[PDB]
Amino acid sequence: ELGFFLETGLQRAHVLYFKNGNLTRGVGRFRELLRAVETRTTQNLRMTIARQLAEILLRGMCEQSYWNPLEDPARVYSGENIFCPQENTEEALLLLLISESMANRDAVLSRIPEHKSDRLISLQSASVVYDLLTIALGRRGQYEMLSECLERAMKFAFEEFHLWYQFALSLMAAGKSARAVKVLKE
Amino acid sequence: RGSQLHKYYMKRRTLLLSLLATEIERLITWYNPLSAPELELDQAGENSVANWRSKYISLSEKQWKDNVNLAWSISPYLAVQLPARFKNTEAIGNEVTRLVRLDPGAVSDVPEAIKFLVTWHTIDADAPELSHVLCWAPTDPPTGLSYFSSMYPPHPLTAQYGVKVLRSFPPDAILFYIPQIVQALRYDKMGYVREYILWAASKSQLLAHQFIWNMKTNIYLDEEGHQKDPDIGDLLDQLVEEITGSLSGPAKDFYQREFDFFNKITNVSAIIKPYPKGDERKKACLSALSEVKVQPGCYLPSNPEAIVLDIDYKSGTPMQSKAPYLAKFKVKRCGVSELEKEGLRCKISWQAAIFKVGDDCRQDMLALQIIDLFKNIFQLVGLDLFVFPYRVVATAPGCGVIECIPDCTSRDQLGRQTDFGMYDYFTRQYGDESTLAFQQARYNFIRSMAAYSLLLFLLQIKDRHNGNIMLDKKGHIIHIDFGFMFESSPGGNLGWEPDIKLTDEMVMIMGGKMEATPFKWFMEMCVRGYLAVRPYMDAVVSLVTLMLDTGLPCFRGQTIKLLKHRFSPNMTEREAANFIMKVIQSCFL
Numbered sequence: 001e002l003g004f005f006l007e008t009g010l011q012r013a014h015v016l017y018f019k020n021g022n023l024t025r026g027v028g029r030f031r032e033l034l035r036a037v038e039t040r041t042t043q044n045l046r047m048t049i050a051r052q053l054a055e056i057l058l059r060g061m062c063e064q065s066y067w068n069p070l071e072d073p074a075r076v077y078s079g080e081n082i083f084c085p086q087e088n089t090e091e092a093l094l095l096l097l098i099s100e101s102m103a104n105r106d107a108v109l110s111r112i113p114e115h116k117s118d119r120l121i122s123l124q125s126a127s128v129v130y131d132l133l134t135i136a137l138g139r140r141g142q143y144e145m146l147s148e149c150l151e152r153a154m155k156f157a158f159e160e161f162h163l164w165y166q167f168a169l170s171l172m173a174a175g176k177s178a179r180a181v182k183v184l185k186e
Numbered sequence: 187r188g189s190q191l192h193k194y195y196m197k198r199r200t201l202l203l204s205l206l207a208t209e210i211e212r213l214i215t216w217y218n219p220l221s222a223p224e225l226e227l228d229q230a231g232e233n234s235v236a237n238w239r240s241k242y243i244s245l246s247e248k249q250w251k252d253n254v255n256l257a258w259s260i261s262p263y264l265a266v267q268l269p270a271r272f273k274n275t276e277a278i279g280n281e282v283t284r285l286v287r288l289d290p291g292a293v294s295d296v297p298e299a300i301k302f303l304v305t306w307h308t309i310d311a312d313a314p315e316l317s318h319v320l321c322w323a324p325t326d327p328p329t330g331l332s333y334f335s336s337m338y339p340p341h342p343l344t345a346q347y348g349v350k351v352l353r354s355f356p357p358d359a360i361l362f363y364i365p366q367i368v369q370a371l372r373y374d375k376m377g378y379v380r381e382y383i384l385w386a387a388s389k390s391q392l393l394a395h396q397f398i399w400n401m402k403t404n405i406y407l408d409e410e411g412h413q414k415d416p417d418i419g420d421l422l423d424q425l426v427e428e429i430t431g432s433l434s435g436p437a438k439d440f441y442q443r444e445f446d447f448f449n450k451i452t453n454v455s456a457i458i459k460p461y462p463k464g465d466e467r468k469k470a471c472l473s474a475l476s477e478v479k480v481q482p483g484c485y486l487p488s489n490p491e492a493i494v495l496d497i498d499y500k501s502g503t504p505m506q507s508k509a510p511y512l513a514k515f516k517v518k519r520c521g522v523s524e525l526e527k528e529g530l531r532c533k534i535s536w537q538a539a540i541f542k543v544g545d546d547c548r549q550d551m552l553a554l555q556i557i558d559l560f561k562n563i564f565q566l567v568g569l570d571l572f573v574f575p576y577r578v579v580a581t582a583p584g585c586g587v588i589e590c591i592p593d594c595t596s597r598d599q600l601g602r603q604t605d606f607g608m609y610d611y612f613t614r615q616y617g618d619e620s621t622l623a624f625q626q627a628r629y630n631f632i633r634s635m636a637a638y639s640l641l642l643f644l645l646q647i648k649d650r651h652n653g654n655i656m657l658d659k660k661g662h663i664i665h666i667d668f669g670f671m672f673e674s675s676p677g678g679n680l681g682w683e684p685d686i687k688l689t690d691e692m693v694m695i696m697g698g699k700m701e702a703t704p705f706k707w708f709m710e711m712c713v714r715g716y717l718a719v720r721p722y723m724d725a726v727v728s729l730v731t732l733m734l735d736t737g738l739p740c741f742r743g744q745t746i747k748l749l750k751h752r753f754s755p756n757m758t759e760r761e762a763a764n765f766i767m768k769v770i771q772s773c774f775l
Contacts, residue, residue, distance in 0.1 A: 109342065113377050151318070155342060178291060182321045 007045075023060065024073055031069050035076055043102065047125075050099050054132055057088055089136070096133045100149070103129060110156065126156055127163075134166070143174045197256060204242055207235050208271055215759040219713035220706075220767070247277050254281045262292045266299050274756060287316070296323045304333075304344070311339040319343055324351045327363055328725045334370040334379065335732050345378045352382060357390045358522060361490075364396050365551060366732050368404065371418055380425065387429055391437060391526055392490055394429065395444070399487060399581050401426055407737065409544055411583040436530045440483065447484045451513075452585070454478075455543050459509035471502040471511055482532055485525065486539065488579045488587050492519045495534065512590070513539050538590035547586035549738060550578055553645070553668040556726065560641065560719060567718045569711075571637035572630065574664050591656065591664065598653040607691035608657075627661035631695065632704060634662040636711040639686050640719075643769070644752065648675045650687055674740045686773045693774075700774075709770065716766045723753050 017026045030053055038046070066088070067073040085091035108122045130153050137146050150167040157163035168183035214232075218225055250273075258265040265285065269278050279302075286293065286302045293299045300322055306313055320343070330351040333344040352360070360367075370379055387394040405422050407413050433441065454474045461467040476499045484494050494517050501514035518534045557575045564571045580586040604611055616623045642650070642665070649670045656664040670676060696704045727750060734741055754762060 111376075112381075154318075154320075158346065179321070186320075 027056070028069070037075070037077070043106075047099060047103065050095050051129065051132070054092055054095050054099075054136075057092055058136065061088075063087075089140070092136055096129070096136060099129055100133060104152070107156070110158070123156055123160075126153065134170075143170060146170050147174045147176075201253065201256070203238065205271070207238050207242075210235060211239065212759055215763065216717070219710045219717075219763050247275070250275065251277055251281045254278060254285070258285055263295070266293055266295065266302075270298070272756075272758065290316075290318070294321075294323065296325045300325060300329070305338065308337075309339065311341075314341075317343055319347050320350075322347070324354045326725070327352065327355065327359065328728045331363070331366055331370065331732065332728045334373055335728070336373060336734075337728075337731065340373075340375050342376075345376055349378050349382055353385075357386075357393055360386065361393060361396060362555075364400055365548075366729070368397070368400055369733055369736070371421065372735055383425070384429070388432075391440075391529070392522075394433070395441070395487075396490075398426065398429065399579065403580050403583050403585075406583050409546060409584040440529050443481060444484060447481050448487070448581070450478050452541065452582075455509050455511060455541055458504065458511065467504060468502065471504060472500065475499055475502050475513070483529055485529075486515070486517070486537070486587070487581060488539070488577045488589050489517075489537070491522050491525065492517045492537075493525060493528070494518075498536075501538075508544050510540065510542050513541065515539065538594075540588040540590055542586050542588060544584040545586070546584065546738075547578060547580035547588075548736065549671060549740065550668055551580075552730070552733070553671065554578070555729065556645065557641065559722075559725070560637075563719055563722060564637070564715065569715060569718065570633055571711075571715060572634045572662050573637055573641075574662070576666075591658070593659055595657050595659075596653070597655045597657055600657070601652060607694075609691055609695055612661075612695075628695070628704065630661040631663065632708050632711070634664070635692070636708055637715065638663060638665055640712055640715050642687075643685050644719075645671055646673075646685075646752075647671050648683065650683075670740070672740045672745050673742045684773045686770070688774055709767070712770060713763050713766055717759060717762060720753060720762070723750070723755060 014026045014029060017029075030049065033049060034053070083094070085094070103126065106122075107126070108119050110119055112119060130149065133149060134146055137149075147167070147170045150163070150170050153163065154167060157167075164183060164186060168180060171183060172180035214227070254265060254268065257268055265282060269282060283302050286299065287306075290303055300319075303317075304319065306317065330348040332338070333348045338344065367379070367383065374380070383397065387397060401422055405411075405414055405419055407415055454471065457474055458467060458471050461470050475497065478497070480494070480496050486492060486494060494515055496516045498514040498516065502511060504511040515537050516534065517537050520528070554575050554577070557573055561571070561573050561575065574591060576589045576591055578586060578588040600608075600611065612624070612627065613619075616627060618624070641647075647665075647668065647670065650665070654665060654667045656666055658664065675681075696702055696708065699705070727746070730749065731746060734745075754765065757765070
């Protein structure tokens, strides 16, 4: 139940690859990592790599610098009904959506009986993932689903200025007025 | 297209006619409680109204939801207020709930509209979406506290709203509802209530003293105390050890002085027990009282709005019984905020206090809270009902302090002295029935008796003998010793005792004949009071529900159903008047 040697010996490999600059090898390794069958015990690490991909796939290439994984620039999931990625925004939104959906169920519900560290870590992770989602989605001029996502995330915020302010700004930009005024007053 | 406008007017005409008929019926019912054949109005209008009511009361489930849709199309406020005008059909509530769920942003009036959205499901606990209650205006404290009981499953949004509504009131209001807050910790799977308690204790001062005094007693279960409850005993110990020590400076000195003075004045009862009955006990009690000195800044726990001035060193008088006694103090009344500010720097009457050791003092708190709520309702309505809510505070397991009403005069002592009816006593005291003083005394007696009888019927209080009723100098009658209520009944639930105690002497006080005018005044007063107190069922239900797990002997499981049934929530005003008149008349002879 203690993964101590595999994690370092596998992660520092692509860390050094990024340090040297072998971007193609690293992104191909990530692509073949994501193709593995999901494991319930590894979900947490999945989060990491997924978010890491969302960090690199938006700031390291352009449209003409994209290539299909079947060519150079046991059981594997396949089929024809699968959603083949087309553009960077498509797969980025898909990864962010699945990450948010899987992270909502893992929330600590702000237990706060006597300890605070776990809730702080959960809040930081939620904040960073929602910030990534809103920066990814706001560029296209699509606001209402952003308002919906902030409404979904509203569960965590109790005395946080950042989340309330973001939700109010998104609601006011969407078009609604009364709710925007009420959240502005709050 | 004339047909469109024609039907557009016809529907509104029909709805307006129905509403006017209902309002006129309610007003004429309120006019005279009894039938009163002498009083009469236009016959044709009454007949037409009755015919229209009969015509409209036969509507099926259909052609009535469309009425709700039309009312919503007119104005959402009218649709929300529609179920208040009672219609004996459950489709109205379902349609209103569906409409308000479809668009919750159209309404922001909290006292009625919140309950149509808060309970998406009563106990099912599903579908966590579209619930945004972080914008509704604050409501009454009982409504917020209802979310922490067993009525609703826990949910973060409801708890957050409850904390928010609880954190928008002056300290005295929170001081009124202290026991419910501490009892809410049992179902508090979360820690929001604990954080609110810590914040409130840090903010004010007297709230902390009330909190510690209440929580000291509740840790144990028995009267003497040898078995801590396995549920929240450890949590109570942790909270009490956490709250103390945090305070420092003048507040710490004030707390230490107050607690030391209370311990010094309390230990006398324990000290006096070994000495047997006799003058030796009385003189020892006097010496012990003389030993204690007066410390400036102290205040009586039962009366947190006064500052004690001095103690009388000759008023000690233990009573029969367990070693209780009676004490007399000279006190000054200042207030609450001024007292709070003056306690950190250093209209005068006398008060009497009774200290009881070894008996529970928790049911009386519920009884007096309900009495105070009824008094507030009656005062707001504008009627004339007299009730005296004497105060009492329990401080230690089995230990409590009870206020004494000024000029105490027990009925049992007067009966022993006279061995005759109270009518002769009143005639001797005031004179013949033709004088004005007798009339005023009779009016006050009727005022007190009507309210007390209504309360006694409503709360189902048993064991009311001649030794419990208290008579004042003016003529009002006051009840005491509310130990038995709801289900508890001395003698083995024989049940031959009537709901309302009416002897022959009290009847002949009112003239002795059912056709006498004072009896009619009493009847109409009771009917009006019962009709006025009805629309506040939910608050009392929540208050009595929140404390079901204290394990008091009175509770037996079926109290809630009977209490809700006794209010008759599916009844019209005239039927309610008929019911109350019938139940009152059935208890006579």
